[PDB]
């Protein structure tokens, strides 16, 4: 079918690939008897999460019908969708951030280096492909830019997501290469003090075998801190390219006339009107993508002639990019 | 000065004492060389940004002027406000989820019950003195309930995530009475296989000097078991006193028609009014508070008398709640 599926498509396939990504992560965590592949796959279930929500978001927009519970549609749920996934994200960068802290200051050594980077590849794969499907982030007939401007917002939002984790499958990559070929792990009877993080056994076991021995350091120690530099890196990074989303988010659910629409020359327009003598309460904001709505309260003189006002009116709003009026003449007292 | 600052004062009040508080959590995790009470700091910093936020949108709910931006004024930036909040409380609830289950299976002994104990009643009483301050959680002349709603529903977020914080204080209290009481630690040559959690340390130690001796069990099993599960439980609670208000404010941003209204009745009044044919394009929606939006495209027959037609339809939204309304009369083509 062809149902307005542009995007629904496109979420299915995103949280298709992610579930048999999150299920790949889970058995070759349990085959190599790893754990820290297990909680990167319950990470993985926010990003699923995230799906979820925008899919959800979507299927409440494509109910665009005036009900009895919304006036409008839920038209607006995408919009909300984007700054749901935006709010969720920010969430989770600061969440990073913390955890990016701890690893400066109690830093945890990697295992399997070989393992972790074959896992980082396949995410890498995952979520390229992923990029690659949201690569592309009286009133006329013009519906087709307020749909184009919604799907934008939400999978918008979920590109913000994707790319979080292409981020992050980058760093893992970059932390397995470098601990691959620079890091020298430490597992029983190797003369290594760890110089680098406070060590349970690497003290105890090496004292009672290396009284004045030939001892070895564990390996370089910039390493170890190569993993939550580049997060922090990634986090400043997505809260840039969260700024503008979220945003615009927050703008269109908080009324926020549209940058496209400047309120002096449209009311100066709406008083140059001839038969207008008063314009109050003009308020314009903005639904969902095109569809701007301004309600004013105009003051006329003649009630017979109100018509052709109303329909000049129009006409400026028209002009002006406004196409869902609402016109009151406040007829003088007689 | 008490120019709006009622809802301002005690958001201050609250940062200062979670201040206050991360100050003192610090200084004793720095005085008895610990690190998770460092971590807890980092993640109290999560509230401070709650209330930071909250702060943020009383401050910009408090301009109420309908400046060349917004159309409106920013009242609903409070509203949003509070939906941030309830997001970012559910994110950070899913994060603690993420975290319980790991818990649940690579459980950490808790060190220092005591002082830890002692951390967990000085944060219950902060947040028991921050419940108790939230602990309330034409056209008429009443702006004071939509005040009133709107201030209940951005404290209500900042109450969720205090209740969300005195919950997390209860279980560490808990917690590290249970663990006072029956857990018993191991630290040094302590006969201790440890058959909780598997430690390479705890296992080497013993097995050098422990050939057939009497060797004994470190604790109970379900001791270490008991902070997740709590947590999960909060969690569920929290989840459930954070949905009401998400949605509210969800709906709120949704342009969803009040409960409080119904559009049925609502437009058989209209079209029971005298000179009104039609009543199309009925739009109502909430700003903020008690502050609703109707607009509606009324269709009238004698354009002299539409003064009085317009005052019956005004008489019949004031009626129905509805005192801030814009009618646009489509006259007969003639």
Redesign the interface.
Known sequence: MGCWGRNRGRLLCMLALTFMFMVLEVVVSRVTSS?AM??DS??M??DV?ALVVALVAERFARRTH?T?????G?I??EV?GAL?NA??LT??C??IL?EA??RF??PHEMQQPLVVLGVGVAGLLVNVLGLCLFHHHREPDHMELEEDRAGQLNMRGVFLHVLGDALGSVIVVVNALVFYFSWKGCSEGDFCVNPCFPD??KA??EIINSTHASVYEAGPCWVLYLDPTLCVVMVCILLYTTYPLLKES?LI?????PKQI???NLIKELRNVEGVEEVH?????Q?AGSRI?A???IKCED??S??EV?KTIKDVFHNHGIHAT????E?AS?
């Open positions: 754990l297990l909680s319950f990470h279930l926010s999460l005036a009895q519970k919304n006036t409008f839920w607006r749920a909300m749901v709010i969720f969430g989770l600061f969440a913390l802290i701890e200051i109690e349970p056994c105890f076991v927050a659910l908080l009324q926020t006339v400047d309120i002096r309460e003009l308020h314009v904001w639904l709505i309600t004013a309260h009630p017979t109100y018509m109303a609402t016109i009151q003449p007829f007689v």
